[PDB]
Design an enzyme around this catalytic site. Structure first.
Site, mmCIF file in Angstrom:
data_model
loop_
_atom_site.group_PDB
_atom_site.id
_atom_site.type_symbol
_atom_site.label_atom_id
_atom_site.label_comp_id
_atom_site.label_asym_id
_atom_site.label_seq_id
_atom_site.Cartn_x
_atom_site.Cartn_y
_atom_site.Cartn_z
ATOM 1 C CG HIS A 61 55.834 2.803 -27.968
ATOM 2 N ND1 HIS A 61 54.513 2.666 -27.913
ATOM 3 C CD2 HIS A 61 56.245 3.528 -28.896
ATOM 4 C CE1 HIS A 61 53.868 3.608 -28.891
ATOM 5 N NE2 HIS A 61 54.963 4.260 -29.363
ATOM 6 C CD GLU A 63 56.576 -3.597 -21.974
ATOM 7 O OE1 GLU A 63 57.538 -3.674 -21.384
ATOM 8 O OE2 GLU A 63 55.823 -4.442 -22.446
ATOM 9 C CB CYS A 92 53.506 4.683 -23.693
ATOM 10 S SG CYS A 92 52.882 3.928 -25.237
HETATM 11 ZN ZN LIG Z 1 53.997 2.341 -26.024
#
Ligand SMILES: [Zn+2]
Length: 188
Positions: A61, A63, A92
């Site tokens: 991810h 982030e 997420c």
């Molecule tokens: Zn994530």
């Protein structure tokens, strides 16, 4: 860095072709109580796509990578640190839990994340957004004025000036309304 490097990622409006693309830009600053040092001269980028060298994406991810980047810099707990991340998408669920606990382990760092647009990954998850605002660091909608600052730092406007408009800001006002509801439910 290319003059339109920041605009290219933000100009992903048309990316709605059935493909998922993620662009994350962040900066790091060192602040000392006696003086403040701005390392803005240097910058970096993070992607939510797994490394191509190992073969097909395995799962990463954008982030989440930023949260792991802080502990990798071995920041000093006795020194103040100011880090900002520019991203335009919802995090997420796994990131929401890490973002809240992360600050709990490091409240001496000032972390601010600006989301141009926020989409709820799932329903009934409104509580996660409320907790995210409290422990998920400070989150606000990116305004054209804030975009101008990233434009000068992320891209060398020298010879390439950016012309901002209050069009995207108008949509942010409507988005602020829905986000305001989350903050409006801030129970005392
Ligand atoms: Zn994530």
């Amino acid at each position: 860095m290319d003059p339109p490097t920041f605009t290219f990622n933000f100009n992903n409006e048309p990316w709605v072709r059935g493909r998922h693309e993620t662009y994350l830009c962040y900066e790091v600053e060192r602040m000392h109580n006696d003086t403040w040092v701005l390392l803005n001269q240097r910058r970096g980028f993070l992607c939510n796509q797994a490394p191509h060298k190992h073969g097909f994406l395995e799962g990463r991810h954008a982030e989440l990578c930023f949260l792991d980047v802080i502990p990798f810099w071995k920041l000093d707990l006795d020194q103040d640190y100011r880090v900002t991340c520019f991203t335009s998408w919802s995090p997420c669920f796994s990131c929401a839990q890490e973002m809240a606990k992360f600050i709990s382990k490091n409240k001496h760092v000032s972390l601010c994340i600006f989301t141009a647009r926020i989409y709820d990954d799932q329903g009934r998850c409104q509580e996660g957004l409320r907790t995210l605002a409290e422990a998920g660091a400070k989150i606000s909608i990116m305004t054209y004025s804030e975009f101008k600052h990233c434009w000068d730092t992320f891209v060398d406007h020298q010879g390439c000036p950016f012309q901002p408009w209050d069009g995207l800001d108008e949509h942010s006002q409507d988005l602020s309304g829905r986000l305001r509801a989350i903050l409006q439910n801030q129970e005392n």
